[PDB]
From a paper:
The RNase III enzyme Dicer-2 associates with its partner protein R2D2 and cleaves long double-stranded RNAs to produce 21-nucleotide siRNA duplexes, which are then loaded into Ago2 in a defined orientation. The Dicer-2–R2D2 heterodimer has critical roles in both siRNA production and siRNA loading onto Ago2. The present structures illuminated the detailed architectures of the individual domains and interdomain linkers of Dicer-2, which were not visible in the previous cryo-EM reconstructions at approximately 7 Å resolution, and revealed that Dicer-2 comprises an amino-terminal helicase domain, a DUF283 domain, a platform–PAZ domain, two RNase III domains (RIIIa and RIIIb) and a carboxy-terminal dsRNA-binding domain (CRBD). R2D2 comprises two dsRNA-binding domains (RBD1 and RBD2) and a carboxy-terminal domain (CTD).
To reconstitute the Dicer-2–R2D2–siRNA complex in the pre-loading state, we mixed the purified Dicer-2–R2D2 heterodimer with the let-7 siRNA duplex, and then purified the ternary complex on a gel-filtration column. The Dicer-2–R2D2–siRNA structure revealed two RNA duplex molecules: one bound to the helicase domain of Dicer-2 and the other bound to R2D2. By contrast, the R2D2-bound RNA duplex (except for nucleotides g21 and p21) was well resolved in the density map, enabling us to unambiguously model the guide and passenger strands. These observations indicate that the RNA molecules bound to Dicer-2 and R2D2 represent a dsRNA substrate at the initial recognition state in the dicing process and an siRNA product at the strand-selection state in the loading process, respectively. A structural comparison of Dicer-2–R2D2 and Dicer-2–R2D2–siRNA revealed that, although their overall structures are similar, the central linker becomes ordered and interacts with Dicer-2 CRBD and R2D2 RBD2 upon siRNA binding. By contrast, RBD1 becomes ordered and interacts with RBD2 in the Dicer-2–R2D2–siRNA structure, indicating a structural change in R2D2 upon siRNA binding. The present structure revealed that R2D2 fixes the siRNA duplex in a defined orientation. The central region (nucleotides g5–15 and p5–15) and the stable end (nucleotides g16–20 and p1–4) of siRNA are recognized by R2D2. By contrast, the unstable end (nucleotides g1–4 and p16–20, containing a U–U pair) is not recognized by either the 3′- or 5′-pocket of Dicer-2, and instead is exposed to the solvent. The central region of siRNA is extensively recognized by RBD1 (Q11, R50, K52, R53, K56 and H57) and RBD2 (S124, P123, K145 and K147) of R2D2 through sugar–phosphate backbone interactions, consistent with a previous study showing that Dicer-2–R2D2 preferentially binds an siRNA duplex without central mismatches. Notably, the 1-nt 3′-overhang at the siRNA stable end is anchored by the RBD2 and CTD of R2D2.
Residue numbers in the entry:
A (entry chain A): 8 to 24, 25A, 26 to 254, 272 to 345, 354 to 426, 436 to 538, 554 to 581, 582A, ...
B (entry chain B): 5 to 69, 90 to 163, 188 to 211, 215 to 311
Write the structure that this text describes.
Amino acid sequence: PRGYQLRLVDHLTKSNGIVYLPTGSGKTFVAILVLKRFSQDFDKPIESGGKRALFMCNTVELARQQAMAVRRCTNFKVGFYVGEQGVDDWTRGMWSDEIKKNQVLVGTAQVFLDMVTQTYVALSSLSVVIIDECHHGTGHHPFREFMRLFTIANQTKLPRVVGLTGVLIKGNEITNVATKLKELEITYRGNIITVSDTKELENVMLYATKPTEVMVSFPHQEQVLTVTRLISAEIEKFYVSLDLMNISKKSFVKQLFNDFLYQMKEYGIYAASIAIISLIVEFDIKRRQAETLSVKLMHRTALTLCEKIRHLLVQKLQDMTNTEEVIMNFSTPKVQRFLMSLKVSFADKDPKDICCLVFVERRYTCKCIYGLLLNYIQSTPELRNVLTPQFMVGSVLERKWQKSAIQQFRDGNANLMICSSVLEEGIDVQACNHVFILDPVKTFNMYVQSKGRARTTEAKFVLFTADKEREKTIQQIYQYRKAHNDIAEYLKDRVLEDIDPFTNENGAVLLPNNALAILHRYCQTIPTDAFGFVIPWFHVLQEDERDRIFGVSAKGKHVISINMPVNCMLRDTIYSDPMDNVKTAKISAAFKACKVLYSLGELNERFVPKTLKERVASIADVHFEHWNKYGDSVTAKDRTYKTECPLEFYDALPRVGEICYAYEIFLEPQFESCEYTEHMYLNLQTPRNYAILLRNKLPRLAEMPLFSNQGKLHVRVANAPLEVIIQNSEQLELLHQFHGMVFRDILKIWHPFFVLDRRSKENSYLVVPLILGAGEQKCFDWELMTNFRRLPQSHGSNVQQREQQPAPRPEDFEGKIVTQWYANYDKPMLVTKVHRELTPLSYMEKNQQDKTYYEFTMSKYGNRIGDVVHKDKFMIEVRDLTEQLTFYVHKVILIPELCFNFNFPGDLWLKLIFLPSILNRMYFLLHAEALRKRFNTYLNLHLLPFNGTDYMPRPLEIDYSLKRNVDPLGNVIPPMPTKSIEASVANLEITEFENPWQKYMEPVDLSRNLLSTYPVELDYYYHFSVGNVCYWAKNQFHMPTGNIYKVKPLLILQKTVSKEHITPAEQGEFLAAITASSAADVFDMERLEILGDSFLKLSATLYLASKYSDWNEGTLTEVKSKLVSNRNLLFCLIDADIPKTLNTIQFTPRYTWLPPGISLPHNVLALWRENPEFAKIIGPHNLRDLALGDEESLVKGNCSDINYNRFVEGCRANGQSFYAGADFSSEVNFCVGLVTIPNKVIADTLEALLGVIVKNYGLQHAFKMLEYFKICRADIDKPLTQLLNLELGNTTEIDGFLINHYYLEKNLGYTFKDRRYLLQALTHPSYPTNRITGSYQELEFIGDAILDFLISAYIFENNTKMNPGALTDLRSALVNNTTLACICVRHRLHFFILAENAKLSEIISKFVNFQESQGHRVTNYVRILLEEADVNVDVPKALGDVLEALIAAVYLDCRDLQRTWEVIFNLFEPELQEFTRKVPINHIRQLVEHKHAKPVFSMVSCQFTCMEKTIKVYGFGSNKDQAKLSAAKHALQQLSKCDA
Amino acid sequence: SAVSALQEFCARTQINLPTYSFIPGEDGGYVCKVELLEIEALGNGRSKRDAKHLAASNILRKIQLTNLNRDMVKELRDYCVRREMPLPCIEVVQQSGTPSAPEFVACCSVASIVRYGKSDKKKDARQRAAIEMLALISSESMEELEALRRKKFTTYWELKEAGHTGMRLCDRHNYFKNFYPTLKKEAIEAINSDEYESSKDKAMDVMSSLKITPKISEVESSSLVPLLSVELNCAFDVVLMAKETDIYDHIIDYFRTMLI
RNA sequence: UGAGG
RNA sequence: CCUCUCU
RNA sequence: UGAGGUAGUAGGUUGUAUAG
RNA sequence: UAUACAACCUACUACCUCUC
């Protein structure tokens, strides 16, 4: 059912009344809710339909506390008017100005009484009057006098009166309860409204069961000791000496000493010894807290008397001998009887069984009895390990320590509670099996409250009394009982307490009775927060209201209106059919509302609420049709994709007599000349180059950056082809042979299964040398090609052959490539220069003088090489050529005779080393322009001057932030422990974090540990309290105006609004969009993925909001998740035929690359494609064995019959072998042009491609692309492009809910033209009064998307220098509900939310107090706090959702994404700056990167070591990841508590 | 570590390695002069390792462009023994980081008050904890007078030999009772005796026996017979106030009761 | 000044 | 007449 | 890649001397 | 409990040489 609180609030709305609830913490909320219900006319001036509210209190302290409660829990200006401000000294004029400015007036009864009498304010102007502590009405009290002003008044316009009373009757006034309560009801013109005793609230007066009352009488036994007389004489001498001193005051000193004397009379010598220690502590604290010397002297002498009294009491104790005997013998008979009673009642009973409360009158008695009890318990080996004492009193530290003590009792750690007398308010403790009132009862409230704690009928209520007062106390208790029963009788009657069934077109039945249940089930399905479900609200139409709705029919019958939650489709009131019985009238309202719902749908054939699965199945064909063709359904790993070369490279093998195109490749070293880089600088810039010869023309390509071992260089492909026509077949044979020579010999890429490929099917083009043979044009180098069909082998030389041939000539080795037959095997090296001066005999230039070089070469390899034959020739200077074939992740003076001379130019050998890398970048750059041209055409931007045929590509840009870790030699790579003890823990409250000290720094309780404390600990308690270790003119909505820790236009929005700012899509951006992270290249797609993902979410949100306007956020969120899911984008991109052209493998040219113009033998390759049966079996081992050579590898293209049969047999035999694994797919995939790509890289590509369109073209053009990818099926009526301006979607009526909307609008930084959007944004599903608009939930769906895109666009453009991994973390942190909740609290927008949930209000107040403590800034403590998503909760989701709804409402009103940006930036600028300097990380990442805590993760349970304690905390979450995150959050909380 | 980093920087720059000069220095602390190529630096600490790791920090800071000289653990223990406070427990409770340069956290707990010191060496971290605690606990011939008045260790090695719990706040009242037996019996035979003509003479004799020099001062009061404040020079900080006539009987009474 | 004693 | 509260 | 050497850092141990 | 000197052991860091 509804809250006891919300049922009270409605009654008080209909009629005047005296709200009575013994149990506390409910009246504040009830007062706040009754105040807001009478706040409709607050804003209007008092001249024109204006009303103001009053809050009168008996005391200044209570008036102040209520004034602040109303300031913290409401959005209405509050004015505190009490005596201390000289209100008596005011004028009619001043009072009129005060009632104009303020809206609620909080004060004391005396202030307002004069105000209404002097006619400064009138009863008619006021709207509600709330009397806190209204039991004070009786007599001539100003509360009663104010109500008498209500007898002589308009009698038409009289304000509602609400009386909140904790205690119905004043202390010890029980003569005639009935007459007194009747007089109280006559005084306040309203019946007392209480709540029946229930689980929700317990009423002490309306309970029937009574415990077994026991009267234990204790003997006088007045044997007077002399120690008490001596102490008394000494204290009175002190009193005489103190009054005379002329001066943390004398009164305080008298107070404490008199209280000790009370403890010594009432509780005996042993208890007094425990209590003098308390005085010693308090007099020591005050001596330190003394400004002037005179006071310090007074406190020092008081302390010295305390030390003397401590001694006299202690010696009396020792004369007898903390033993039981010392305590019992030397104590008062009252205490003796209580201790004896304690022993008999709790003797060896199970500890979890006993729960008892001992009640004392004074607050210091608690401490002195707690000490006595703890020592007695330690002493008695029977009552030890049976009872645990604890005390409570009915400063930050004092409140914190009391809260801890009460929580100890509730969880059963502490069996006994010593409570100070109840006084004004009851005790928050569970039903106690034994209640023992140690100190004589003096009040009726005390008796009722104490007895009410012994709830169980078996519980014993013992009250200890004097023999002399026995007869008197019996009467007082008996009169209280008679009185209590009389209050019970009076409050018993004040307690807050046919139809034709519808037949479906398909046969079904909807009986009306089932309909109330059916409506409740439907309400459960609607999107709901943790705080609870919202049930429909029924209201019996007033007789006067019945007139408008119905005429003759509404006579002699009743009508019930049903209002469904504001989230549901039925936002219209459904008045029932006029019927005789109120009970039937509800069965009619429910039946009618259910029938209306069925028409709208929202119900199955059997009238069962429609599930999410059924809702999505309906939208399946409209949107997710392309899923079915891939054997998948939206209702109820990785994939392999064939690779297809660019169309420019397909069928590009040159022919004979047909024009061919040679594109020259220019390498330009972007490094200067110094000895290390001299050879590279000159050799790269040599006029001789090489060219990509092919039949198809090539597009303009971008300059690409390659990082050599000596520095960086730029590779450029010539825009202007060189057109050459081949004369015959011999020239083409030379071309292909030289191409094969380059890859086989110079680059060692050849495999034993590679055959030159003369069929022009795929990746068929050649590489040709060029010389400046002609004056201007560079002729093809036929001479070089004829000369080097195959590179010469290093035969070495015979010692005699050496002697014969004239091997050494200076000119021959000017620039060639040479290798040494000895040592380095086939290591080719470049002759940089040949020193003419140096000779084998020359002294080694090397600072290590070995004299003649002839010495070292012979010494190193005497056996390997004969002594050099020619002793007088130039020495070659060589520089090694690196054996690395991938180039994008950022001096031996040998003897000539000994080196085999390859006659290759050597200007070309380096350039050809970079060729494999250049070809793999040309391959993907060609695909990139294919995708560029394809998308510009669909957008019809192809004809634009910059995007047209005149388009010049821009040099590729290097992301300088990618980690790109490098293994040695340029390959890209794909502590101390200590022992600790074991423990466990309980979840930390938000309140604990508010305190600014670590747990270890907290001072000990001197109060609960009086005998074990040292003077050192007392010094610490004082200095910590000093802080040496750790308002009525300003509105609630005021921002502090300082650093918490003209907005520049976003370029994307500028490109969207204006055509002029559009810049061309670039080939470079498209290469980044296709290049995955695995490619291990300088650029990737992880950044465009961010902008693209944000756009896709923004566009899917706007599309679903426009197409299906009348859905709940639940269904829209679910359908949006399916639209943006990895599976949907996978299927869309696969349908788009783009995933074949993707860069997703690391470039190893030696193991996994099939070079252009060469392939597997046509025979084997055909076997693979024609026969899928044998495809699986073929493995790398089988292919290597082919070893075809000579004719089969070059001139012929098919493996020989013998080889073919051998291959086939070997592979099928492989089934019966060690290699039966058949996971051979990865190794042989490159051989047949297949690439396995993870399903995530495909969706990341689709988003990256959207991102390239969003960045360069703008939102409008990007929307058209979604139709291309078939993500959004655009309806004929509404264009996809106009999604932004599509309709996503009484002044006094709206402004009634929005009271101080001026301050909301000032803090937001935007003024709303239409406030309907503002009211919708602030409304909450629970709010039952707003029938104009819907809830935040609808606007929140739109706001989350808008905010995410706008923030993502900012982080993308501004924060270029962050690893794409951080730009994700930054985005996640900024958009988190916690971050939004903090900004909502900081900007003071929490006050304007419209809800009626008690839990929600409770948690919002706690979170606002915590944030105010922190300083309105997003700290780690807020991030670790539990949130609604993690799944009680201390971070409400409503605070962030309201901020998102306000951001949506700003856009909906303005219809400008630049104004919405300006608002968002002014709100988030502090967060943006802070999170850019220090980006926060995941909770799992924090826990695993913590230096001292090694996380062990199992309802996932994390065992971590924190400062010598191994604590395991369990995380409960619906999902395994959600449970792990909860465990990590609970852990991080414990680490934050006990840190170093 | 600082030394390791300076060591590695020299290797990387391909320059001369640092030369370290340690002298005995002032008080008990050595001073370390780092000699580096083209620069000179200074850093002094309690131990040679401590001085070296400070020298290193100072020179390293000038290239890019405190250490007490006593045993603070021992000093804190001596201070606690002197003031009668529960003896400190300093224990390394957490080791974490690379075995080449680790991080050690050590707790120091005088009674319930804990302060943490963290460093790169087990000993340095203990010293760090001890220093932090001493400052918090803190915020000389008297101890000679208090030694004659009552048996007291006044240093840790004297205590370690004999083998304190610490005076609880509840048990501070026994201060006069714990005075040396010879002094007490005499001050009692002085109190019980009535040979003295004046109570002023008795009061002075009993206080003189206990070696307490009284501080009689003028307390401002609205009374004909002067109100005087008798202050005492003892750890207990006894302070009494009475009228002139009663001042000397109250001294006698306090002493009798407390001495009993 | 109002309530209680 | 006193306590508490109020002005 | 493996092996060896030099300088350092941190822990533990042992023995001597010193202060406390 | 610190300090100074010498030895042993363990874990690690920088550099160098040789080899692959």
